[PDB]
Amino acid sequence: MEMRVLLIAGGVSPEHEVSLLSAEGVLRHIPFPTDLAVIAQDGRWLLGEKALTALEAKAAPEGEHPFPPPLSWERYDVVFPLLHGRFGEDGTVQGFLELLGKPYVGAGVAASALCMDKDLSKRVLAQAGVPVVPWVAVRKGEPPVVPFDPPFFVKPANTGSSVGISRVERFQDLEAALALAFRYDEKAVVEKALSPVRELEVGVLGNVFGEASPVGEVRYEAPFYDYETKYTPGRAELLIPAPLDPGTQETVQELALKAYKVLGVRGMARVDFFLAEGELYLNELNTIPGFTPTSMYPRLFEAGGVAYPELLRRLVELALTHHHH
């Protein structure tokens, strides 16, 4: 069976650089012939050799081709969008690939848009009976109304890689944290800070009915799991399988697969959890998790017997299983 993959990375979101790092990880292990297309930070695309040059520079601030690119789509059998964050993970790029008729890796338009919004996903999961941290949404320009005591975490609703996230100890500091969050999104979420908190992560592989990886725990000495901790090698420790009680591992996997099914995710997702005072909370689902050298999604399925090339092979294959339907 003929298979040629087009890999798209970069993007206009703050995670532009993280996306190129993920692209390098995928290219080093994907078992299919794969071409790279880069979306530069200005929204213009780089194709062919100019895309590989931008990958070597680990940043593409400016691109060549305005959207839509003159890409020979017919040459590829599956498109692998690796665009973390806004305009890549939130269903907008997915909508373009749907109208293009090309099979593509990962969640569709709906699952991507709803998993990217920290307020909407928490609305759906809370109704479904999934435990979530207390939270409220704040629209840019509206006065916040936080019906619980600090500490808070303030986040852009569409964020990734902990960009624009603040831990707020005093109400005096809510205004500055919201102003930081509103640089990246018109909507912010304010969550009750769990402290102390343990952070659990589990990978999911599959279309709607997912297969769960072992549960992993992230540990670090920074105040929280911030940008520098996430992508500086050595700062983040992954303990697989997570040191959890008899049965706690299964509950984490059951919640992840439940949220996966309810939201209708296809392909993959990394589901993050909080463990505080013995209580589990689902933090978020990431439909396009990182494949950077310090990323956890490949390591989680590595520990579950799915090697890195086999994981990428199954992702491309799941894209065709849905498209062939």
Next chain:
Amino acid sequence: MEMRVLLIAGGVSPEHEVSLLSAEGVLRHIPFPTDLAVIAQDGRWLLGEKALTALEAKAAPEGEHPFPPPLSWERYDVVFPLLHGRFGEDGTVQGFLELLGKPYVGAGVAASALCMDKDLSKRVLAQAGVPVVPWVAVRKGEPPVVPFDPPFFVKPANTGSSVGISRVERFQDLEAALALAFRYDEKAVVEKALSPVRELEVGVLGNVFGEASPVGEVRYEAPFYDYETKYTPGRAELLIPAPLDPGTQETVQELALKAYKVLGVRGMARVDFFLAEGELYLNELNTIPGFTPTSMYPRLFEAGGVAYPELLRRLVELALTHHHH
């Protein structure tokens, strides 16, 4: 008039013909110079005179240009996506227009995908405290588990114009109703049927400060408000305002504006309600309501003092005042 609008109608959804009818209604009343582009049922586009020709035919089975079309997008200030249903109303075309950077009428990607999914939209509305009909989601290839007794209403999760919807009386008939619904979507909803029921519909207009139209009511002698009843002229009784006592009409508008904000809609929406034994239930929210001769949304706002050309003009202005934000 310097403003130039691009109207997109047709589509690959079962509502292809309905979309063309809506295009004729909008083209007749829109006060800006408007070009039409038609998405044929095979996904290929028709531009210029061939799109006007398909409009007179009220059906476009085959197109000419494969997506993405060679449309001079820079000619148009606002794009009006008038595509009901799959690949038009569910966020796919919205994501494409987002990447084009074009201002467009109606809800964004997330709110479009959320409002089209009758399961996920009900979960969000229920979590916000909005009354909904008891329901359950049934996935294709998965046995149904319905915690309430028939009569049922079985629908494809992402449908419009009552396509694939069945009224069910006995559990022995559920599997055939689910089999019809699975011809249009991998997911279906089974709702508790309300009989007798009155059907109330309200239009909403705006981005941040949505304003409600007067409440209207649909009456019919057919079993339910099905496809033939919706679009055969004279078949449905459109009562504006609805013969209700004022307190019920004000409550309907209050709920519609609450659901509008809860679901994150901008531009427009028609909110459908059920009235059964004195209780109001929100049925669904349509981000691209029909503009056919038998359609409720334009009429509701003419009754509220907003003429047909003024309605479309404000839809276009709202698309511009959102973009500039």
